[PDB]
């Protein structure tokens, strides 16, 4: 059977649409990227902070989100010369607008009934909430998929997503899959360069690379309680955001903006490397996915901070780093429909294995 996966992550760069075949293997068949319209991007970011009239605002924003998703699905199908009927189901994450696992809730918008109506394909959606209901963080969910791809008897591996947020899957032989969110990935580097220069992101980490790390600031940032925590943990824009950074910056006289950028890159690399090696000290291979894999400067620093391990993108292993998250949700649709568990209890802290998501039939 073939499955579509739809992901729109933290970074709000665009929508990912993937087509896989699931048999004994998971094979990527096709992909399609649609950049996020600037208006829709702003309207989603506006829902990530508490504000007024959120029920109505969210209901309208998610109509536009779903329409874009359905358009992307249509475009992939046309490109591949396939009918919808050839696809078993779409696995749709939706869009996170609030993540408060401490308060036992997570909010992904993306009106699945409307996605089913527009695409003519069954939709499996709302994957995180059964994990949270069972006492879990609800995140990260990719570890079960990372296992399916890269679980190796002889090799101690970390599979590292660097999206807006970073998260790692620890694949240790003869051990439960573990993992967690490491902290910020691209989110603060993207925020800072956009705040300062109106750029979307820091191309190849060049701006960061042109600056010097500021020790006082780095120490300030790394002392956030999130970094000290071990075991299951998940985060989001609730914690790591421009106001948070500004608060730290206020405690010292002004710095060059590129030094701040440089420190933000070091924050990402340090929080990742230290949480990864704290959990899996005998790691021999770090398999990097997400768009952070294209930040040359970041990838260099990760290799330096983890000299024991080979740091490489998943491309080496036949999986494009950009499409890993899309692939995961396609996979999760399959897991739903076969009634196999989608969470990893030692990742999320949930009471046990759970079937994740909900079916909206065409």
Ligand X SMILES: Nc1ncnc2c1ncn2[C@@H]1O[C@H](COP(=O)(O)OP(=O)(O)NP(=O)(O)O)[C@@H](O)[C@H]1O
Ligand Y SMILES: CC(=O)N[C@H]1[C@@H]2OC[C@@H](O2)[C@@H](O)[C@@H]1O[C@H](C)C(=O)O
Instruction: Please report, as ranges, the residues that interact with ligand X according to CB under 6 A.
Output: 7, 9-11, 13, 16, 161, 163-165, 185-186, 190, 201-205, 290-292, 294-295, 325
What sections of 151-282 are H helices per DSSP? 187-197, 206-209, 215-222, 225-228, 242-250, 257-279
| Among 23, 39, 50, 174, contact with a copy of itself (rule: CB under 8 A) | 50
Over the window 75 to 104, marking each residue x when it contacts a copy of itself by CB under 8 A and - when it does not, the resulting string is ----------------------xx-x--xx
Residue 358 contact partner, candidates a copy of itself, ligand Y, ligand X, none, CB within 5 to 8 A by sort of partner: a copy of itself
Q: What part of residues 189-248 is at the interface with ligand Y (CB under 6 A)? A: 234, 236
Choose the stretch contacting ligand Y; rule: CB under 6 A; options: 62-70, 133-141, 199-207, 244-252.
133-141
Residue 139 contact partner, candidates ligand Y, a copy of itself, ligand X, none, CB within 5 to 8 A by sort of partner: ligand Y
Query: Is residue 357 near ligand Y by the rule CB under 6 A?
Result: no
- For the chain, the residues before each gap (C–N > 2.5 Å) are none
Query: Alpha-carbon torsion 35, 49, 218, 9, what sign?
Result: negative
CA distance 236 to 99: 7
CA distance 111 to 57: 13
Query: Is residue 16 near ligand Y by the rule CB under 6 A?
Result: no
Running DSSP on this structure, what letter comes out for residue 34? E
The size of the interface with ligand Y (CB under 6 A), counted in residues, is 18
Query: Is residue 266 near a copy of itself by the rule CB under 8 A?
Result: no
CA distance 346 to 147: 13
By beta-carbon proximity to a copy of itself, the closer residue of 14 and 135 is: 135
Interior CA angle at 126 toward 121 and 132, to 5°? Answer: 160
- Longest Cα–Cα distance of the chain, Å, equals 61
Joined tokens for residue 188: 């603060």
Binding site for ligand Y (CB under 6 A): 9-10, 96, 99, 106, 139-142, 161, 163-165, 167, 181, 234, 236, 325
């Amino acid at each position: 059977p073939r499955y579509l996966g739809l992901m729109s992550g933290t970074s709000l760069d665009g929508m990912d649409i993937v087509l896989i075949e699931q048999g004994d293997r998971t094979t990527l068949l096709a992909s399609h990227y649609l950049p996020m319209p600037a208006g829709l991007r702003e309207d989603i970011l506006a829902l990530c902070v508490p504000g007024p009239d959120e029920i109505a605002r969210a209901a309208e924003v998610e109509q536009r989100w779903v329409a874009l998703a359905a358009q992307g699905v249509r475009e992939l199908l046309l490109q591949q010369q396939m009918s919808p009927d050839e696809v078993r189901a779409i696995g749709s994450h939706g869009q996170t607008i609030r993540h408060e696992p401490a308060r036992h809730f997570t909010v992904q918008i993306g009106n699945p009934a409307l996605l089913a109506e527009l695409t003519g394909i069954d939709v499996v959606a709302d994957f995180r909430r059964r994990d949270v209901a069972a006492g879990g963080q609800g995140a990260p969910l990719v570890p079960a998929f990372h296992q399916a791809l890269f679980g190796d008897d002889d090799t101690s591996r970390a599979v590292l997503n660097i999206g807006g947020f970073s998260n790692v899957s620890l694949l240790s032989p003869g051990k439960p899959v573990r993992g967690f969110d490491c902290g910020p990935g691209n989110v603060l580097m993207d925020a800072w360069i956009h705040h300062q220069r109106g750029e979307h992101f820091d191309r190849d980490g060049a701006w960061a690379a042109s600056g010097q790390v500021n020790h006082a600031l780095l120490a300030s940032l790394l002392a956030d309680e999130f970094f000290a925590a071990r075991g299951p943990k998940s985060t989001g824009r609730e914690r790591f955001n421009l106001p948070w950074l500004q608060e730290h910056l206020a405690r010292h006289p002004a710095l060059p903006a590129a030094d701040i950028q440089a420190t933000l890159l070091e924050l990402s690399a340090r929080s990742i490397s230290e949480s990864l090696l704290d959990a899996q000290p005998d790691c021999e291979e770090v398999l990097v996915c997400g768009g952070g894999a294209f930040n040359t400067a970041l990838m260099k620093r990760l290799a330096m901070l983890m000299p024991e391990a080979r740091v490489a993108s998943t491309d080496e292993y036949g999986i494009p780093p950009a499409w890993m998250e899309g692939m995961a949700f396609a996979w999760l649709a399959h897991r739903f429909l076969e009634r196999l568990p989608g969470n990893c209890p030692d990742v999320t802290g949930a009471l046990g294995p759970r079937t994740l998501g909900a079916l909206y039939p065409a």
